[PDB]
């Protein structure tokens, strides 16, 4: 009935509380910081073998092996140092939108338009990779998936929900609801206690893995948020959307901290990733090239052109030595 | 320079060979995207089967005149089409099913969906095969009710021939390119072979046009 009035009053109170703790801006504080030079990155390796659009990829925790999922029903696992194909996994459903690599490295994950998250065991005594789990229960397509501890996995789906699954059982341990549009991406905190999810309602939400609540929501974008990633510290994150912005929010301040727009860019943003120290922000666009931003000064510091189509996936190794970018021209490039 | 990395390179080369063979085998197949609204009549089209638990996508596999067809039905997604339609950019053709027996302006929403799909930024070259289903029920409906309920601006009389032709021409004119893609239309009949023959002919024409573009003759 009139409960909309109470909701609007609470929203106004939240806005006023956020305003009351906004004394300065990060740009003003960092205006005295010496800028970084023109970040020049060169392509070291090019990985060939995919015959369709590469839709997702993920680094291993050893910063040497990486999994790559493509629309030809392939889940190729590469050794990046020598460009050797360690594994080639065929998928029952060729419509894949995400892939993940277990922190230990014994499992990989896959998912897509079939609403199923498949967990494949890499280390078997038979010498072949066989599917070990086929988690099902999501109604929409799967947009992202991330391993927690080789037995728990968080999956965001296109039915405006997320789930936490226990792999050995196959049932959703927890279900996260509250988004209005499709959840397009998620990222885990470094301690794997919280995770942020960005949805198509131009909103991001911080969820507690344990006891499954939504702690705080962040707005400010004008379109669907396609990518999200946590700061290395764990107290901030960055979200890229279709309005050509890479807005960086802070958890503790509960406010927007910085926007990374530019008049030249007019496209959406597909992937967002940070550096080891958090001083650089790498974002993949539809201009077929990636951009590097000074995370503290919102100044572009380099371009990673070299792809003939939309850059769909982007990631940085845990040791931070290289950056892997994969695009729709069926090629993955390592930059250093 | 290599001690047992040579065997790793050999394994990688074998993997590459397997990938190449699988890619060729997959590229030697025809892929179609089945689309339509609710109660459109996709059942009478997918009933021509000649060869899962997930309610996310349906793959119908069949063959005709040694040609291999895989048809993808994505009607169990209920999400925004712009989120996952780009996955079907390289399909050979779209197969759009429209029911002629509709009234809650169902034909209006079918026309809106057709206009949205045809003028999509991804399907700027893929052809569309239009299947007008339930022609006999439409004939009974027009014998009972006038066509002016759906289109009050209709000037012709009320007979199956001219009304069907008017609907077909309106759907054809709903296209906004008319220069890079073609629309093939068929009125679905009770014979199980005529529909597949029409699909085969349209696919052959699309293949010929694609080869003309590839060979530099266009």
């Amino acid at each position, epitope marked *: 009935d009139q409960l909309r009035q109470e909701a609007e009053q609470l929203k106004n109170q939240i806005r006023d509380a956020r305003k009351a703790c906004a004394d300065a801006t990060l740009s003003q504080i960092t205006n005295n910081i010496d800028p970084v030079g023109r970040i020049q990155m060169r392509t070291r390796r090019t990985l060939r073998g995919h015959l369709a659009k590469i839709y997702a990829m993920h680094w291993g925790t050893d910063s*040497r092996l990486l999994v790559s999922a493509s629309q030809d029903g392939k889940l190729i696992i590469w050794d990046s140092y020598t460009t050797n194909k360690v594994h080639a996994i065929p998928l029952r459903s060729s419509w894949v939108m995400t892939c993940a690599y277990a922190p230990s490295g014994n499992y990989v994950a896959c998912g897509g338009l079939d609403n199923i998250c498949s967990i494949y065991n890499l280390k078997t005594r038979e010498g072949n990779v066989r599917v070990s789990r086929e988690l099902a229960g999501h109604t929409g397509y799967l947009s992202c998936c991330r391993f927690l501890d080789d037995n728990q996995i968080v999956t965001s789906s296109g039915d405006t929900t997320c789930a936490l699954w226990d792999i050995e059982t196959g049932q959703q341990t927890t279900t996260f609801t509250g988004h209005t549009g499709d959840v397009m991406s998620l990222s885990l905190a470094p301690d794997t206690r919280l995770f942020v999810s960005g949805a198509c309602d131009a909103s991001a939400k911080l969820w507690d893995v344990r006891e499954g609540m939504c702690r705080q929501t962040f707005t400010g974008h004008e379109s669907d948020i396609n990518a999200i990633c946590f700061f290395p510290n764990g107290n901030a994150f960055a979200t890229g959307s279709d309005d050509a912005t890479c807005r960086l929010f802070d958890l503790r301040a509960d406010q927007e901290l910085m926007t990374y727009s530019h008049d030249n860019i007019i496209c959406g943003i597909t992937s967002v990733s940070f550096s080891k120290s958090g001083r650089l922000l790498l974002a993949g666009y539809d201009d077929f090239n990636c951009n590097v931003w000074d995370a503290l000064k919102a100044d572009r510091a380099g371009v990673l052109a070299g792809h003939d189509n939309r850059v769909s996936c982007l990631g940085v190794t845990d040791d931070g030595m290289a950056v892997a970018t994969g695009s729709w021209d069926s090629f993955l490039k390592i930059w250093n | 320079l290599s*001690a047992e990395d*040579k*065997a790793a390179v050999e394994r990688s080369k074998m993997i590459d060979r397997n990938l190449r063979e699988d890619g060729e085998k997959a590229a030697r197949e025809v892929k179609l995207l089945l689309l339509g609204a609710g109660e459109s009549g996709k059942s009478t089209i997918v009933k021509q089967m000649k060869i899962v638990k997930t309610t996310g996508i349906v793959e119908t596999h069949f063959t005709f005149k040694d040609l291999h067809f895989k048809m993808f039905d994505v009607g169990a997604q209920r999400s925004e089409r712009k989120k996952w339609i780009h996955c079907f950019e390289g399909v050979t053709a779209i197969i759009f099913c429209v029911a002629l027996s509709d009234e809650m302006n169902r034909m209006h929403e079918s026309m809106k969906l057709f206009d949205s799909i045809c003028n999509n930024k991804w399907f700027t070259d893929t052809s569309i095969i239009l299947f007008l289903n339930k022609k006999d029920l439409f004939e009974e409906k027009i014998k009972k009710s006038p066509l002016t309920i759906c289109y009050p601006e209709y000037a012709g009389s009320n007979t199956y021939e001219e009304a069907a032709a008017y609907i077909q021409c309106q759907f054809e004119d709903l296209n906004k390119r008319k220069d890079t893609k073609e629309i093939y239309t068929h009125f679905t009949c009770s014979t199980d072979t005529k529909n597949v023959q029409f699909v085969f002919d349209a696919v052959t024409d699309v293949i010929i046009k694609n080869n003309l573009k590839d060979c530099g003759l266009f």
Partner: single-chain antibody
Amino acid sequence: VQLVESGGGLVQPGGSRKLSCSASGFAFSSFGMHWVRQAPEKGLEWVAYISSGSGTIYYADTVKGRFTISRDDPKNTLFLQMTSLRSEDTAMYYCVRSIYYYGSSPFDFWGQGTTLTVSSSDIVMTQATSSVPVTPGESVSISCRSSKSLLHSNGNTYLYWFLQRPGQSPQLLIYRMSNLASGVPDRFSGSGSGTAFTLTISRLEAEDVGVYYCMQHLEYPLTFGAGTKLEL
């Protein structure tokens, strides 16, 4: 997972034989296969190797020319055809599987082997000690030494430690000098540098008695060197 060998027996000198190795329980097409022979009361000696897909084939010097290793993948079988069997070929032959990629463990599984009896430079691995008297509950150190450094430019030291219990086929313990195999108890450990390597057993039990062998995988001749016996 098992490999069963057949075709052994007694052969007159100058004859011919065909040993067969049937594999069941694993993807035979993805594994390279070695034939390794052990003479009566002597150390193991590498004989032959055929890769996956039969791309590359390697033979030992003593058996090159008169031996031929082949595989048939549809039927999951490995063949060793040997002619002109001299009196020095009497041994027990073992069928070994090994897969090679990044982080793999080659030589992980050994067949039971078959006995064949016949009537009447590159690199060397040295194990100075041949037998030590040991008691349960104490730590043992077994040392191995090579003529050429096993370290490579990619950071890998290609040294493998195998254990052969009395009356059983050898079982892999350590690969790449520092990695514990699958199912090997934690108490086993391996270390070393370049030329000198050591294997340590912390608190042994009655199941650790047997012969320990070191093996190199840097240059393909694949020398072994006589093992060290642990009893009592």
